[PDB]
Design a protein around this nucleic acid. Sequence first.
RNA 1: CAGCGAAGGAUUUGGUGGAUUACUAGCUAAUAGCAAUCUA
Lengths: 823, 806, 125, 213, 39
Amino acid sequence: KNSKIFSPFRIIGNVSNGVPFATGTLGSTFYIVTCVGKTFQIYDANTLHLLFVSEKETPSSIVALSAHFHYVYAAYENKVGIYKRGIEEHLLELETDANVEHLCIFGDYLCASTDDNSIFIYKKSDPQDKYPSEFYTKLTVTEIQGGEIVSLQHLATYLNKLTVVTKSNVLLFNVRTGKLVFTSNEFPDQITTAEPAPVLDIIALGTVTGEVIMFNMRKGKRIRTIKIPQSRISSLSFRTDGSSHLSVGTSSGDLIFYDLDRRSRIHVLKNIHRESYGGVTQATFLNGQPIIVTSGGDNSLKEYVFDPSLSQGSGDVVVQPPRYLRSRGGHSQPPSYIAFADSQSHFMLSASKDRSLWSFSLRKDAQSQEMSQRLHKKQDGGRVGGSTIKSKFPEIVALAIENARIGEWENIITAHKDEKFARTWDMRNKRVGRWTFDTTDDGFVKSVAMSQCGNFGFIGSSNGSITIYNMQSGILRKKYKLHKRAVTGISLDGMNRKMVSCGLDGIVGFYDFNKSTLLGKLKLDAPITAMVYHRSSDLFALALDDLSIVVIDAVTQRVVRQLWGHSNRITAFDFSPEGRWIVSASLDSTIRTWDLPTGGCIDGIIVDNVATNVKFSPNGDLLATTHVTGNGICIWTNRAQFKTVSTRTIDELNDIDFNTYTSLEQIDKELLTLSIGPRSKMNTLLHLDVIRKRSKPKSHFTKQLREGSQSKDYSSLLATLINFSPAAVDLEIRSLNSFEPFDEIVWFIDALTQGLKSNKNFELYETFMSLLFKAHGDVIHANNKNQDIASALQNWEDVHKKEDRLDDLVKFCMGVAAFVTTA
Amino acid sequence: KSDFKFSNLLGTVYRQGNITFSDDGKQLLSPVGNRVSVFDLINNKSFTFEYEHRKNIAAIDLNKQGTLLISIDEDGRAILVNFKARNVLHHFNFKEKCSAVKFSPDGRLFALASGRFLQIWKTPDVNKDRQFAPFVRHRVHAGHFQDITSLTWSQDSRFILTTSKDLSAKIWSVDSEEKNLAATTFNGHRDYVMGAFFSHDQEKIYTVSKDGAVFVWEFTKRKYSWRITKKHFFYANQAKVKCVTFHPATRLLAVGFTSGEFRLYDLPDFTLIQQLSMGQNPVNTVSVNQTGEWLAFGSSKLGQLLVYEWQSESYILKQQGHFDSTNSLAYSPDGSRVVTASEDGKIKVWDITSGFCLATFEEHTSSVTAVQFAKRGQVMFSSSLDGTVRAWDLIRYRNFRTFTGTERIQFNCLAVDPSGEVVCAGSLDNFDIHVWSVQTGQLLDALSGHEGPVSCLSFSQENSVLASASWDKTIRIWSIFGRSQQVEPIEVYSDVLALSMRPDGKEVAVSTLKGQISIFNIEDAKQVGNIDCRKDIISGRFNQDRFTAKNSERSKFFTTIHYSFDGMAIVAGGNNNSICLYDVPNEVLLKRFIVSRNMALNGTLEFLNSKKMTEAGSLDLIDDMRPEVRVTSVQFSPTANAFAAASTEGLLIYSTNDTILFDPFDLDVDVTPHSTVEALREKQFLNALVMAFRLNEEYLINKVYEAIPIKEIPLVASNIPAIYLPRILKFIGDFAIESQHIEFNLIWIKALLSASGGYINEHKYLFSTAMRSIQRFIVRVAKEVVNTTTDNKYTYRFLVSTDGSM
Amino acid sequence: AVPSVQTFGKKKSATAVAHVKAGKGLIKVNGSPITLVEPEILRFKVYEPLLLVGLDKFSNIDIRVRVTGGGHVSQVYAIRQAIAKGLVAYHQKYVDEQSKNELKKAFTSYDRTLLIADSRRPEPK
Amino acid sequence: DFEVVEEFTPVVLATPIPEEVQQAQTEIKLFNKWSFEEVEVKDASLVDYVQVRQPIFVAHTAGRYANKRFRKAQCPIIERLTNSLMMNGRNNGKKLKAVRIIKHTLDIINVLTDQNPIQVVVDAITNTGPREDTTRVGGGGAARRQAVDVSPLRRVNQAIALLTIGAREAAFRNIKTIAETLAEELINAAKGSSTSYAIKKKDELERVAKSNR
Amino acid sequence: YKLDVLSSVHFVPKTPTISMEDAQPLYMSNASSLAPQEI
RNA sequence: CAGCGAAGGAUUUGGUGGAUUACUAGCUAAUAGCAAUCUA
């Protein structure tokens, strides 16, 4: 479903999926376009950084992509998208319902092929524009002519020809007249790969038995055959820097380098990619380069360089074996548990079902690196246990970071699957910590937490004991024993005063440190499977097993909120870092947001895969969720930080909705009210003569005034008068054109009288009166007892007399405030 | 309570880049540091953006809708920001040193000038969501030979006119289908052309060289193409042109030179209108408002800016700051104005409501070491290395006393009796504490007892005992007054810096040199406890040092601490880039701020980049020194939770906005903002008030507070319970200081501290920061309003009751 | 080689040196056991560093203390100061710094004359 | 119910400590025999002027309680008593002898009247401290006085002085030692039985204060 | 200036109508800031 | 001496590769050509 709080952003930590990649050249550079599920990615090949991604996803998954110079041709369910710089520039809808399988690009004619041996070829409208945009024709290979298709390409120096590679036969085409030209001979077994050679007009094609035939299509023959025992071949390539080297890639994770000038195996490579995820999906030489780019299905891309020979005289006979060069990987199975390392939302930690731990970096995606399982040696004489072979660790269940004493001693703690102890790690220098924190009651570790002062670690075992440890020696401090079944959540406060235990028995135990007694016990009426403490605001939210999210504040031990509304087990929460929201994902494939003040459900995203883990960033900008499937980790951007959002309980006044509140103009007319805005308008109006005299270097209004005079109300005049600049106010009010009658002066004094009659903006009306008095009060004192201006001043003071309660109030309040702050 | 977001940066009103007004003439964007400040002119306010750059920024622009700005630093790490939400949107790395960026008048295309290439990109949207790669490149043009210097558009978004340190200045059409309309190149200047401008109609093209020449290109005849019609000139002799701008519609040129001078002309007539200077250092950037009334001039080296209204010559704001000389800090005892004492020897006086100075004091010759306030707001003392502790009245804004020693020794710390009768100063080279009477300027005495220099001083605010701390590893307590003159020493482990005693005057926090901070009750000599503050202050490895940041011991200690005003939390800052704050009962860190994340300052990074290291010497010690990061003195404000810290980039000021937090107080299942709004609409006002306080949502406090009517404010202010008085008193303070319902607020305060005055009287330190904001509010808006209304009353009474006609 | 730490402790003229190393829990003053320390009425003044914080912190270290100079009460204050700050320095270096400032909090809450001697006296009134 | 396990191997160290000492590590008692808690100043107005909230082991703390004004009203009452007990011209300086004889004293105080001797000596102080006196004002150099009241520091100090010098004067030329003489003086003062020297002098001084009031 | 910049630890940075005098004292729009004794 | 302890344990040190700033592709005469060539 569409959302209204979180928008999805990117699936980070994901490199390849198993689709054969493509490569492209630009000048003397090389870029690798790999597929990741639905979007693709464009790395470069020199430093292997990321360069581009698709700006938005595909409808289906991408089945096949290729690349010319600037443009990337992606291919999914029915279409082929011509892309530039990761932005889609042209869709091409195919004239069928059949799913596309392969494609090739050459010259003008693009050529894609569906899953029923039907080949749509397309042509550029102008032999000068950038990409094939216009449908040319539709060839169709029938089952008489060969088997069902497995590749197609235009090998070089062929005048508008093409080569379709089936499962039983090779067959050319002349794509201008739509004609077949040369069917090849019969081939006695299924072939699965065909890549062209940089020599003239031959193509190497490998079968399901481990042989490589080298078909010469101009001759129509085969030239040689490389036989290999029972290897399901997957990907061929050739090396083009002069020294001829063929390179086969076997789906048993093998990479064999054959010489061709003397038919010899140069070097084998075993278990380069994992077997079960497809083996070597695609491996190629960069042309004119002695390096190899391999990619498996196990979320890994590698580069293997060929060194120069050590025999300066012999040369091509003695070939140095391939080194290992740059590589980019993620873990190859969906990630189990997910944390955020720093407050800056820069590093995040994953631990996956394939038992590896990675530190992804969501800032720049070449900084992501695996944490390393190399044990610090016991410097008291002991020998490292475990096994002799260095297998990876058991599966990670829970973990806890506190970047407060980072790298100074051990930093993060982890909690493995069904093993009796809980080893610790370090995040700054990125390897396994010295110590293994143990439960001392044979129960497996189920909860781990640590103090935010970075000293104390906390192990919560399946037999209810909570052992606490120190993390700069690895020794035990005290063993809290309250529960009688599996403790599921530990936390401690910010200031280390009270800690909170949270069992499967429903007991939530409020202990305090520094006096090891407990001081509170709560019993909830369900088993409890998770606890997230918000260390800022002292609430903590608990899962239950009647599907509640019970929020308890730790001070007065009340159950302060109870969020109802889920349908299956809630797998994860996180507090928003302000503490306003709980984001919780659950096994009904949903991820809901709870506004915990109102106790309401703001929005629920119906996510297609069940999100296992949900984590907010230290700063409220990123929500990282990890699902049941997918090797990556999907990070989500909340639009609530850029615009304010509603608060409204959905199921499949506006100020208290949008959480805000404007201040009303005045409460009633009985109350005074200053002007809205700056409180320096008063001082600038009272002093703007000396302000400009110190800052020097060494009518429409009268129209409105007589309008409001004859209509006998000046509210429109005052609405004009209040809100313009002090310089213009004084320059206007200084000249008021009053020689004999002073009607304008009586109108103005009656206007201020009507203004401060309302009890509003009365600081401004006072300083306007004082501005007039400094301006031309001399004429008022001169022809004082003029009947009109004396009447205006008389009823002006008669309305001014009501504003003595203000100085009575403030001279009360100032005196009694000084008295209660001193004595 | 302790979630201090970065609120403002006082000091350093401009340092490096280009000033820019908004669309509406309301806000001025100034490239202060690695951040951007925004000065709101009419609503006399300011803020600084929370985001930071990795070096000093060098280009600002926001679109004419005022919605999003981008800012580019010295290597092109462009950062764009929702201006109306103050959050970052996307980071970007243009690969080379940019010089100027300009959004279009349309605001859909922005083009910038990185090096010699110019490049047009199209902008993202505030309404479309945060994409991964939001910048779509429109085109890139390479018609120049040296670095571009400036850039402009037409009034519509069709042509774009660029100018370079290459002697030519060229023009470009933004689409590929107006190439015949403008493709040419304007040669003819002697030196760097840095001005290129369309007229109000696009037919005249004014170009401005560096040596003061102005050509007027016009598309006229001897088909016919851009004949120069006139070579006007400037003739400032040693003043080549530094910065040019030109308002098109009012036809106003404005030029700042090398000589620290500017002139503004009416250009199509070429009439000199104003010619005047701001100092002996060049006007680095002019910019002009869209309505032409205002101009803005930034001079970098003295760090000053000036917005000038040229129609009526009235200066809207003129300001000057410092850099890396911010040697101490003080607040006024009402937390309204700040005093910055700076090492060139001058006492700036800022205020917090605005962002501007209001008074310097250029009196001292050498540095000013420390300041503090005394005697009921309006005296502050300043202590120098001139040999001078001099007083300052802060009402007449003048000096009135200057105490010296007898031999001109440099002073280093000072304190003053809260009953402002004695002033004490301590030096580096005399081992004594000099005491001066202040009502008579003579030297009272010199009291001794140490044998190292006295690092810090203080006076107890209640019982007037003095606490000094010196490098004898020793703190010493003097009772001076009352016939005794009794000393008492207390030993500590290492030598001492940074004493700061609690507002109760009952105990003392000292910051020793081993990375620890102790607390001593002063009725006894007994230590209450200490915080090991060493292993939690990240000290950056410098550029030139040959040891790690771990084994480094430059700043593994603090050099200025301060208490909070309830006596519950010590903020501390040192010669490192961390300012921490601890809470003394539980004795634990509760937050650590980093002060700067740019490598332009020296000691920021604890882990330097390895690629800059060579065979010999790092690649940043090769000159073509670098200033350290320090926080010299830190104080909590009196009337806020906010606190200030004077670092090398001026005052950082962090603050709480309890708006964005859920910080409740013992609520339960029933109490809900919907429940308080229904309790208010069924009008049980006391219950709705405490029902809002338990939520602790300040907009519910605002709503219930305003919707309570006047006739029972004594009744609810009587019935409000005891444990909510600090919250309601401080709420009334910090809302009433900028509110408008003055009689409503004063009715509320009168009701509150009439019904419950005695409880405050026996819990003074519970409400010390509470009812200081109230008194700030009283004596800084309400007493002024009463002053002018009494002046109107008396001027009316005089102008009626007296007569005269001659 | 073996982890050790040497601290001092001074009353008026008595001086106590303390070699604390990793061991089995023996506390010796000039080879004599800690129980056989005269003048027998300030044996608890000697005991209180190892009694305030519990012997479990003394289970893994062993302490040897040399004393010179001073009279009886000066020697027992020197012994207890040397024992105390030797334990504190051992926990500062070789084990938990959290236990270090726990011990420092305990000793300073009881009396800091058990950690820092009050040297610089007298006063010329 | 609930437990807290801090120790995980019992105390078996190489120098074998006495069992009563490693039993005293759980809680501090004076002389390893008398717990300072459940001891209250029964009077008000001397609470926080007789220090009993801070337990000690022996009565020989070497703190500095004479440099400031009132900080001799914070060193604990037992060694306040023994420091006043050391004062006479024959036996200055001998505070180890003073400590051991008040050890024997309060030991036999317990074995006679068993509540705890620190409670006995605390309410002995509260019952012995005088509540008024006079001052010999001039009045022309006549027989002239006027009753005033006594601040509690002077009350506590004069009570301690009266008890100690009463024990000395009653043990001057008798068979009893100063130990048991102070014991019986403290017991009579704890009952307020109007028999001991300090309670007699207290009632006499308040009598002449009431008379010349 | 030059001798005390090399004797220190922390870094030290170093006709028309008017130079505009941006560092002004006395300014809260004050004209008669004199004391009445001084008048 | 002990124990720890899955077909070895524990150290010294070189080289390469990845980070150490926030990931929009190369070149040129740049609204285009190149990437096999800017020449007629």
